Each structure stands twice: as C-alpha cells, then as structure tokens.
Design a protein around this nucleic acid. Structure first.
Lengths: 145, 241, 915
RNA sequence: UUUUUUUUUUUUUUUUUUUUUUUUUUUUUUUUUU
C-alpha cells in the first residue's frame, strides 16, 4: 500500500519569486510526481515444529514446516517467523529473523529464493494497474473537453 | 580511499580475511550483585551482564502458573563512542527491537517450564563499542546464564561477517562497518541451525550462502573458546573448594 | 605492552589526536603484529615455507630477481630501499626504463606518500602492480611484522621514528639476504647500512651520463594553513580558479560565488607565483588601491565591494596569499637558442619555452644542450622559490627533431590522450581461445548451453542475407543491414549491432581501461583504439562469412515508413558480404544483377528516403561541412562527398538510437544515459545577422528548427553556390555544445535535442569506439530481463562522474583530431609553394580575415604590413569596408567581406600571409 | 483363618513518539560511418 500510494501521488508545481515561493493551484499548472528509485516488496514465512524441542536441537533429520502468508488462525500457533524484502534487480533489501525456532540455513536460502518469483509478479501487477488508471483519467479528461 | 583489503591479503589493523579479534571473557565478576555475571572483551568492546533470578515476581500481575517470565534490559552509555551522545538511548525503538530480539532468541533455549511462578531479569551495560555489538551481547548473555546455574539446551554464539565487493571479511570493526554491508548470525551448538539472522543493508541475492558458511565456521570457533574458558574456571573452582 | 594471542600473533594499541575544524579528538586503534610476512625474493629458500593463500586461494608470488644488477667494489649485487622524500620528489626517475630495476618500498613510505599526494601514490601502486622481467617493485609490510616494528620513544618527532623504522627494515634485509651475497642500499637525500644520496647513487651507475639530467632541481610568503583556514571560515578569504591570458601576464581574474563579477588582481607582486588554471586563495584590497587588520573591517570592506560592483565604475582588487591546487603536469617544450653557450663543456643553465602560451618560462639545468638545440622535449616543474624570477625544472624524455612526422606525439600529450600499449593484466581478461573462438553451430548443444547458461534466450537469425557497407579504410564493424518483403505487403527491416558487452564485464581491468579512454581517436594515417585489437578488431567485429554474436532490433515499417512493430533481442547471425559506399553504389546501379539482395538494398534505400523526407518535414538542418581530407603519399587536397549509401544507414542508426532511448527511459526513469542539445543564445547569431543584413542583405530566423533551416535555405547566390555552405559553417560555430547526462538530472522538457528536433536521444550503435554505447547496451540488456544490471549504473553519483569523464574525453579527442589534420595541411602546403585563393569571412579595423575554401584554414593579414603608412588607413563599421593603398602599387582600394584574394604561405620563425 | 477404605495450598493489567550524524574539489563550435 505504501509503495503504490507513493507511486500514485502528485504534488503541486511551484516557482521561486525572489526570496519567497509561490505554490500554484492545481487547476492552473499541472501538479508533478515524485521520483522512485526502486520498488521493494516484503514476504513473510511461518515455521512449525511437528516434534519436540529435543528433536529440533539434537536431531539429525530436519522435519520443520514452512508456509507462506499465514492467516490469523495459523499465525497464532506458529513457532517462528521470517521476513525478507527484495526488488527486481535481485537485491536483498533486508532480512529479519529475530529469534524463535532454530532453522537450518539451507531452508532459509530456499525461502529467500522462493520469494523472488512472487515479488516479480507483484511488481508487474502494480505497474499494470497504475498504467490503466492513468489511461482512464486521460480518457475521461479528453471526453470532458 | 583506504586499503580495506590490500593486494597482499591484509586488513587495516593487520588481520587476514578469516581471523577473529582478541577474545577475553571472565565469569563470576559481581558475586554480591547478582546470581550470575560475566565481563566480555571482544576487540575494543566492553560489556557487563548481570543475571538476577529465579525469584519472586514484583507484581502479582506478572505471574505465570506454567513457566517463568524472562526480561532483558540493555543500557548503552553516552561515552561508548569517540563522540559523546547528545541524548539518552533508553527509549529508542532500536533498543526496544534489540531487547525483543534477545528475549525471543533465549525463550526457546532456556527451560522456562521448570521454573513456574518466577521471573528472571537480565541487565546489560555497554561501556565501549567498536563494531559487531550484537554478537558480543549474545555471547555475554550465554556466559552469564550458564554462570547462574540455569538449565538450557546448548550454547548460542554470535558473529558478524562483512562483504567487501567479492571478499567476505570475518568479525568486522567500526571502520569496516562504515564501508560495507554486514550480516549478524546466531548459531546453536555445533549445528547449522540459526537462531538469529539480521541483514540491514543491500546484499546481492547470489552471494549470501558463502557469507552464511563463513559465519557458521567462525561461530563454531567462538563456541570453542567460550567452552574452554568455562571449563578452566570450573576446574579452578572445584580444585580447592 | 603487547600480548601473544594464539600463533605468534601479537596485538598493540595505536593512539593519536585528530584535528578537525576547531575540534580535538583522540582515536584508539588495535594493531596486530604477524610473523608470516615474506621477503618476496626469488633467491630465498625459507620464506616460501610460511606463506598462506588469500581469500581467493592464491599463493603470493616472488618477484625480485635472484641475480640483480652488480655495481663496482665493494657493494655488488644490490637491492634498493626508497625514502619518502625521494619518492615524492623523484617519481620520473623511478618510471625511467634505464634505472631502478629491483626496488623495495616500505609500508610507512607508501602511507606518507598517500597522505601527502594521492596521484603519486597511485603511480607508485601502478609501478608495483605492473611488474615484469624489466622492472620489479614490491611492498613490504614493516609495520605489521614483529621483526621490524619500533615503538615511538618519549620526546621524539614523527620523522625520527619513521627514519628509525626505515633503518630497521634495511638492517633486517641486510642480515636476511646475506647467505646469497646480496646487499641493500638505502637511498635518501637527508642526514652497517650502505647509505647514499640520490646524487651519489646515480654516479655509481654504468650509464650515469645518460640519466643525470633528470635529477630534480622577493615575493611575499604564503600564509600558514591554519591562518588560511581561519580566514576562510570567518568569511575573510575567498577561493576560486584563476585565469591568465597570454597577451597580458600582469593581470588575472578570479570568480567568487559571493560576487556577480570577477575580482581583478593587478601587479607582478600582487600575483604570487601562480600559473593558469590554479586554485588560489585571494584577499581583498583597500579602496585606496582599487582600479579605476581585523575581521570586522574586512567584512565591512567586503560589503563595500559588493555594493560598489553594481553601478560604481571602480573595480575592487585583490591579491593571492595561498595556492590550493596546481596543475603542473608534464609539459612539452623546446630549448631556447639564446641562453646556450658554445664555449662551455661544463654544466650550464638554459631556458625552455613551453607550447602553452599562457605559461611562463622554466629554467633547465643540463650539460648536453648542443644535441637538443632543434628537438622537442618533455620536462617537469619542481619548485618556484620566492627569490627566483622563473620556476625551476628538470629534463624527462626526448621526443625527436622539430617538424618530424613522429615528433609533431606532442599533440597527444598536450591534448591529454593516452596512447601507451595495454598491460598484461588487461590482456588476461580476454578469452583464452584467442582467434579460435567460434560460435556453436547449434545453440542447444549440451556443451554450448552448459558453457552459456543464458544461451537459452539467444535467438538464431542466421537465415537472412546480410550485407554491411563501410569505408575501404575501415576494419571494425558495428552495423549490418538486411531486407525482405512480407506477403501482406509490409517491409521488414533490421539493424545488427555488435555485442561488445558479452565479452566486456564491469569490474574488470579491461573495463576500467575502456572506461578511462572515453572514445577512440582517429587520425588520417594512424589510429588510437579504445579497445584492444584482439577483441574489437577480430573477435567482436561482424566479419562476413563467419559467425558473430550481435544485438538485433527489428521493425515493421510500411511503404510510408510508419512504425507498427518494434522488438529488441539478442541473437546469432552470420554476415554474407561486406561493401563500400562507391562499390555499393555501383552494385545497385548494376542492372544485370537481378538477385534479391540488390532488391532488398534498394528497398532499404527507398525506406531511408521516406525517413529522411519525414525528418526534413520535422526539421531540415542538413549540413555540408568538408573536413579537408588529405592523402598525399609522395612516392592533392580533396573534399569529402556524401553519397546515397551515406544517407541510407544514417536513418537506420537514428531510428535505433531513438527506439533504444525510449525503451531505456521507460525501463529506468532515473539512471538512463541520454544526450541533449539546448537552444543557444542569440548574440553570436545576432552579430552575424546584422553583418548579413548590412552587406549581403539576408536574414536568419531564430523562431524554431524548421524556421532556421528555411532561413538558411533562403540564402542563395546564382554565381557562387559555395556561399551557401559559407553561411552554413558560419552558423555552425554559434550553437551550444551537446552534453551527455543521466535522465534523473533534468526534466523531460529538457530532454529535447535541438539539432534534430527530437524530444529524447541516446547513443547506441557503436559500442566498440564509444563507452556511452557500452553503457546503453548494458541498460538495454537489463531492460528486457536478459540479465540484471550492475551496481555502477544504478547510482546518480557514478553516472555523473561517467558523464563528466566521457564529455571531457570527447572534447579532447575532437581537439586532437582537428590539430592533427591542421598540422598535416600546413605541412603539405609548406613544402609546395604556389598560389591559392581564399574567401573573406571577417573584417577588422586593422586587418582582414581570409579563409581558404580548399584548405579550410583561416588567415589574418595585419594592416601594419598590408598597408604602408598605417595612419592613412580608413575603416568604417557602417559598410564593413576598409580603405587603404597597397605597397606594390599605390591606389585607393576598398576591401569588402566575402571578397576574393590570393594567399600563400611562408616559413615560421617565432602562419599565413598575403600573396 | 477372623480382622485392615488410604486421598495438600493461592482471584478484577508499572504513567508521556517518530531526527536515533566522520577521513580531503576544477578549465572556450550540430549529425552518421570511420
């Protein structure tokens, strides 16, 4: 929501008149948008232990369970949580795993690799929706001439 | 403009790419103030940790009939850096985040279910700070908890790894932390399972596994050092007493 | 107090005080001491047993020779250890290929050099990196070693501690290498260990007479650094560039942000020892000294100067008290044949005149001035003491005899163009296969797909007849064309561009060298390339009959040449034939050939005709400016001509550039590499317009691009059609300069390019000879999902640095090419003395400017020699006409502009003159 | 062969924001293929 709102916003055009500034009304001089450098998107994972703590800490098998985008019922019973942010340039913006159930590192890397396929589709969807909204506004303004 | 990593394989302080800083720790330093205590020195870091409890709760509201309540408090002094801090750090969101992360880390390791209707309090004082402070906090908490005779499943060790272009550097200091992105890890025992993973700046997706492996090996060495110190202290304690 | 940790590794403490702008802070650092620092000598047999690999798992290499240079008794077989002042002052001797073959540089010396002068540190690091079987430099880490580390004694300056550390390092080498009878010599010009000064060591060499001349050699004093900083902070002192002209050497101007106009500096003493383009610190002068002792008074004086600049006709003056930065690069100059003494075989003092006319004279010490009387030399400037009237310098390198083809090198150094061959490290990045690199026959072969994980996207377009047209002297190929007819009646076109970015990777030495040289420099006889021969000339050029990787763009342009389909992809093709302009014209005009390839070529010709008609509809700024092509080959100054094929590929390249610009801007709206050409002012236009409506009686409209083009087209003369090109080239010198930039800097209205009336533009088609095209290729490869972009092209600061660098190198290359062609024209006209005509383009009150149409070199004839008794001259600006009587036959004759006079060329003593 | 059943305690929440800071600069003419 924050990224889409930032990419949808426009601010009024202004000019500097000597020492002070002038803020033009919107019905006069066509407000202008902001500059966006990249589009980050977050994904959250939830972890469950189907065994006891002794098996998790001293066991050889790794039988922990990971799901994506838990509901309210699921996230009230989870043992751990992980959030990762990524962009379309294959950059890890941030990773947060602040305690919880200990997890093997290969599983965490697999989670990080699964998040990228989701973020690509989300980015494309946002861009398409913004383009369609802009076209609708332009068409209505043309029809109102 | 400085030579962070020279063509001869040397860093600014003279270390190589896979070497730890000087590691010194002490146990039972404040017998009259707490049940367990430790003093940690990692490079130029200086931390005091005190463990109070298990004990009767202060208020009847903070009582649980199935397990104990665990609290962590972190105090960062105004003189811990070269430049004096303008205001206090007590109520910053960063400090609250650190405290919550530590509590959630150590909830799963301490056997809180064998101390019902009690509270355990951890108070931490940071006197000097020179990079990689989160791992030092983890190591100090582990040592102080073991010194207090509180049941747990295994050790947890903290470590920091920086990525300089294509070169991973182990156990970075303040100069390196201001010039590259870093990763902080918390490792359980001698396994590959992570209790904490913290990345705060940008890192390429195809360069993270190598950093993780380097950090895991470093944390295993840190665990070895802590175990050796603990065994030596126990031997001295039991030899005469 | 040090502690032993684990493996002979010790740690100490390092404490010092840092002084910021008024603040004091103490810094504490930890310092580790090791015992695995190798001596890096190939004769040692015990150090190779202590080395460890680095992060990339590479063992250290041993560089220093086991049989070094042998001097006379009693030293023999020596090594050299350097000193800080020797490195700082004598860097030219170290780079000399005739001395200093085996050199050791301690760590403290390198640190001090880096602190005091970064470029010298960079050059020293380059010397260390490029070690071979001729020169060998190493760096020894004496501070990190536990055998050579010393601790600062109480009450001792830092210089003493550093000198003691250097001597300890020299001793450690002296005893370490003894079993191999190798000695160490400490070279330092200040005041066991064999210690010799720079002069003493040179005299021991077997070729001292060949290199002894390269040894490095009342104005008010400058203010102290603390005083200058205090004055700058309080607002008392000001900083800016200084510009000095060659006509007057006793006056200069400095521009300051707080003032609307430059502040004048007048006086031989008011100007301290300063050059042109220096960064200086100025201080205002009292009102009693303006041209017609406390901070508060000086602020009041600054306010007075600010209020007196607007209207009062009194110019505030200033003086120089400090020099911030100095250019002082290597300068090309020639000996002055007036200070030489024939009756003197001893060392004498001579003077050298620099090619740059804005710089003063430099005194040079030598003893073989007779052999350099007629030659060009390279020198460097050392210092300008207060007592001396001229700066002092030393000889560096000898270019060659004056007027020789090779020596006249000089323009490359003066225009700052790199021409030395590539190093071994750059050539390492090239493919190991060399000329045996061939693309796979099948793109899906298991080995082909395994070796190229991205080969699953590369298309196969080897199924079309592809032709390329380039000048006969061209070798590197960047373009290729094809055509075919669709059944529905639409015309399909495709432009093939070489894929440089496949073999060039960001973060490599090859990439760094390519990015340093902004563009390739082309000369009529020689050529300087941005890329190595092996890659660009052979492996990357789209040669016919062989497979070559390329980037492909396809369009579906109708009979009216309207875009309906545009697509970009990376594919594999194979060129069929290569052509030239005249050969292609004879091919298309050859009627007996009825093959489909010529039909495709003529379809491309008609499509380009339609495209250029559309462009002229948008804007008709078409130019015809000869470059004065010269090719003598004396066991004939011609004019370059535009042919149909020249205008054919031009439209296709323009379309590709526009399409790539639009695509990359849509993909990356903040870091897209684009080019622009702003609308120019009117002063240079209005002066020409006034002159034309005075004499020629024409007018040029500045309404728009089409209006200006129509105005240029209006000026027609039935007698001399060459007058049209005269006003075209005259207007060609009035507009602004096109500059590269990144799309995140300016707004979209500022993206317009005036020359072609295009709202957005970029450079894409020639990645071999331009780095901007390489950047555009990387952007367009990242704009399709083929590969993610790198890091350097997603940051505004790095893009700005790249833009500045490429703009500077483009301008320098243009200047160098113009200088070379002008020099060749002058040489070909000096040897052959005949009669050559000319045209008048400018009238002066005491001269006439005459431009030769067949040569393109303007000439000025001074009235002092043009007309006898110059007081009788009469010129008026009403008709731009001067009245005089010629020397040969006295008669009142008037001179106009655009007239015809006969001009010849004489020798230059220190140029054109009336015939 | 009568006769023999032992099992402890507790009640209705500590009070005042986002800012969370270190290693040093430059210079005068469009477009394409070269």
């Amino acid at each position: 929501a924050v990224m889409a709102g930032l990419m949808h916003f426009k601010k009024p055009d202004i000019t500097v008149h000597g020492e002070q500034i002038i803020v033009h009304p919107v019905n006069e001089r066509e407000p202008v948008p902001l500059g966006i450098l990249h589009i980050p998107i977050c994904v959250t994972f939830s972890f469950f232990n189907p065994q006891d703590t002794e098996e998790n800490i001293k066991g050889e098998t790794n039988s922990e369970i990971s799901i994506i985008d838990a509901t309210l019922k699921e996230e009230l019973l989870r043992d751990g949580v992980l959030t990762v942010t990524l962009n379309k340039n294959r950059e890890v913006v941030q990773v947060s795993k602040a305690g919880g159930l200990p997890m093997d590192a290969l599983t965490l890397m697999k989670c990080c690799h699964e998040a990228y396929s989701i973020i690509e589709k989300i980015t494309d969807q946002i861009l398409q929706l913004l383009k369609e909204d802009s076209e609708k506004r332009n068409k209505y303004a043309a029809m109102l001439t | 403009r400085l030579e962070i990593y020279s063509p001869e394989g040397l860093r600014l302080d003279g270390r190589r790419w896979n070497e730890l800083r000087r590691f010194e720790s002490s146990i039972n330093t404040h017998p009259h103030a707490a049940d367990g205590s430790s003093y940690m020195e990692q490079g130029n870091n200086k931390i005091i940790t005190l463990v109070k409890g298990p004990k009767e709760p202060r208020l009847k509201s903070q009582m649980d009939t199935s397990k104990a309540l665990l609290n962590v408090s972190v105090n960062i002094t105004k003189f811990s850096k070269f430049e004096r801090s303008k205001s206090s750090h007590k109520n910053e969101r960063r400090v609250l985040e650190i405290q919550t992360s530590l509590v959630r880390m150590f909830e799963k390791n301490v056997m809180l279910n064998i101390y019902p209707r009690t509270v355990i309090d951890i108070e931490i004082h940071v006197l000097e700070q020179d990079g990689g402070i989160m791992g030092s906090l983890i190591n100090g908490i582990t040592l102080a908890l073991i010194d207090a005779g509180i049941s747990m499943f295994d050790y947890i060790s903290g470590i920091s790894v920086g990525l300089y272009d294509t070169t991973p550097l182990l156990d970075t200091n303040s100069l390196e932390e201001n010039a590259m992105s870093t990763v902080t890890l918390g490792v359980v025992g001698k396994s590959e399972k992570l209790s904490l993973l913290l990345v705060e700046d940008k890192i390429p997706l195809d360069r993270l596994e190598n950093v993780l492996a380097i950090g895991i090996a470093g944390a295993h060495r840190v665990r070895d050092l802590m175990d050796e110190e603990l065994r030596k202290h126990a031997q001295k304690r039991v030899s005469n007493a | 107090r040090r502690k032993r940790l684990a493996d002979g590794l010790s740690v100490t403490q390092k404490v010092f005080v840092r002084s910021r702008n008024g603040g004091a802070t103490k810094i504490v650092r930890e310092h580790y001491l090791r015992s695995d620092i190798p001596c890096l000598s190939r004769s040692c047999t015990k150090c190779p047993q202590i080395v460890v690999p680095d992060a990339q798992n590479e063992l250290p290499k041993f560089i220093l020779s086991d049989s070094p240079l042998e001097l006379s008794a009693p030293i023999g077989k020596h090594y050299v250890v350097l000193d800080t002042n020797v490195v700082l002052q004598a860097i030219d001797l170290l780079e000399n290929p005739n001395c200093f073959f085996d050199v050791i540089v301690p760590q403290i010396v390198l640190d001090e050099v880096r602190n005091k002068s970064y470029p010298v540190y960079t050059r020293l690091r380059t010397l260390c990196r490029d070690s071979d079987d001729h020169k060998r430099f190493i760096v020894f880490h004496n501070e990190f070693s536990e055998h050579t580390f010393v601790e600062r004694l109480p009450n001792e300056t830092i210089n003493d501690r550093n000198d003691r550390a250097i001597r300890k390092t020299c001793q450690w080498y002296s005893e370490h290498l003894k079993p191999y009878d190798i000695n160490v010599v400490l070279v330092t010009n200040d005041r066991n260990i064999i210690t010799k000064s720079l002069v003493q060591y040179i005299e021991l060499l077997p070729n001292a007479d060949d290199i002894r001349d390269s040894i490095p050699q009342t104005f008010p004093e400058y203010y102290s650094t603390a005083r200058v900083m205090g004055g700058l902070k309080n607002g008392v002192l000001y900083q800016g560039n200084i510009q000095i002209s060659e006509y007057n050497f006793l006056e200069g101007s400095v521009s300051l942000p707080r003032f609307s106009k430059p502040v004048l500096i007048v006086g031989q003493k008011n100007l301290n020892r300063a050059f042109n383009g220096d960064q200086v610190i100025v201080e205002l002068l009292p009102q009693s000294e303006w041209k017609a002792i406390s901070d508060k008074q000086r602020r009041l004086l600054a306010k007075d100067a600010m209020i007196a600049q607007r209207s009062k006709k009194i110019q505030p003056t200033a003086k120089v008290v400090y020099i911030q930065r100095r250019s002082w690069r290597q300068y090309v100059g020639q000996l002055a044949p007036s200070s030489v003494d024939p009756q003197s075989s001893s060392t004498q003092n001579v003077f050298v005149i620099l090619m740059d006319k804005c710089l003063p004279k430099v005194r040079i010490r030598t003893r073989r001035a007779a052999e350099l009387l007629d030659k060009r030399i390279v020198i460097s400037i050392d210092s300008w003491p207060t007592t001396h009237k001229y700066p002092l310098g030393h000889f560096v390198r000898d270019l060659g005899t004056i007027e020789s083809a090779q020596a006249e090198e000089a323009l490359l150094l003066e225009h700052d163009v790199e021409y030395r061959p590539f190093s071994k490290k750059v050539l390492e990045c090239l493919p190991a296969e060399g000329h045996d690199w061939k693309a796979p026959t099948k793109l899906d072969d298991p080995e082909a797909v395994s070796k190229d994980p991205l080969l699953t996207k590369r298309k196969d377009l080897r199924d079309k007849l592809i032709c390329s047209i380039d000048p006969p002297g061209c070798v590197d190929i960047d373009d290729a064309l094809h055509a075919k007819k669709l059944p529905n009646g639409n015309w399909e076109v495709g432009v093939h561009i070489a894929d440089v970015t496949h073999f060039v990777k960001p973060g490599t030495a090859l990439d760094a060298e390519g990015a340093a040289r902004g563009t390739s420099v082309y000369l009529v006889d020689k050529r300087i390339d941005m890329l190595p021969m092996l890659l660009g000339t052979d492996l990357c050029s789209l040669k016919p009959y062989v497979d070559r990787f390329a980037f492909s763009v396809i369009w579906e342009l109708d009979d009216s040449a309207n875009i309906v389909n545009v697509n970009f992809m990376k594919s594999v093709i194979r060129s069929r034939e290569a052509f030239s302009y005249e050969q292609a014209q004879l091919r298309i005009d050859d009627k007996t050939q009825n093959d489909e390839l010529t039909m495709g070529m003529r379809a491309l010709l008609k499509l380009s005709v339609k495209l250029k008609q559309k462009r002229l509809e948008a804007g008709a700024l078409n130019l015809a400016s000869p470059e004065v092509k010269v090719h003598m080959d004396s066991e004939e100054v011609e004019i370059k001509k535009l042919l149909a094929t020249n205008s054919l590929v031009e439209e296709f390249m323009l379309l590709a550039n526009i399409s790539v610009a639009r695509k990359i801007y849509d993909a990356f709206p903040q870091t897209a590499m684009l080019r622009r050409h702003a609308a120019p002012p009117s002063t240079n236009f209005e002066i020409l317009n006034e002159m034309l409506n005075t004499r020629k009686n024409m007018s040029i409209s500045l309404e728009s691009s089409k209006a200006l083009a129509d105005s240029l087209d209006r000026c027609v003369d039935p007698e001399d059609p060459y007058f049209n090109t005269l006003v075209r080239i005259m207007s060609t010198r009035c507009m602004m300069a096109a500059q590269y930039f990144y799309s995140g800097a300016y707004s979209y209205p500022d993206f317009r390019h005036y020359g072609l009336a295009v709202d957005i533009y970029t450079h894409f088609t020639s990645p071999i000879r331009r780095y901007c095209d390489v950047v555009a290729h990387r952007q367009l490869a990242g704009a399709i999902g083929y590969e993610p972009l790198s890091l350097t092209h997603r940051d505004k600061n790095k893009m700005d640095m790249i833009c500045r660098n490429i703009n500077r190198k483009h301008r320098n290359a243009q200047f160098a090419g113009r200088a070379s062609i002008e020099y060749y024209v002058g040489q070909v006209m000096r040897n052959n003395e005949s009669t050559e005509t000319g045209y008048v383009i400018k009238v002066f009150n005491n001269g006439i400017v005459v431009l030769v149409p067949k040569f393109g070199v303007e000439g000025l004839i001074r009235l002092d020699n043009l007309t006898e008794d110059p007081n009788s001259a009469a010129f008026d600006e009403v008709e731009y006409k001067l009245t005089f009587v010629p020397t040969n036959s006295d008669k009142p004759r008037d001179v106009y502009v655009f007239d015809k006079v006969e001009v010849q060329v004489r020798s230059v003593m220190d140029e054109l003159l009336l015939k």
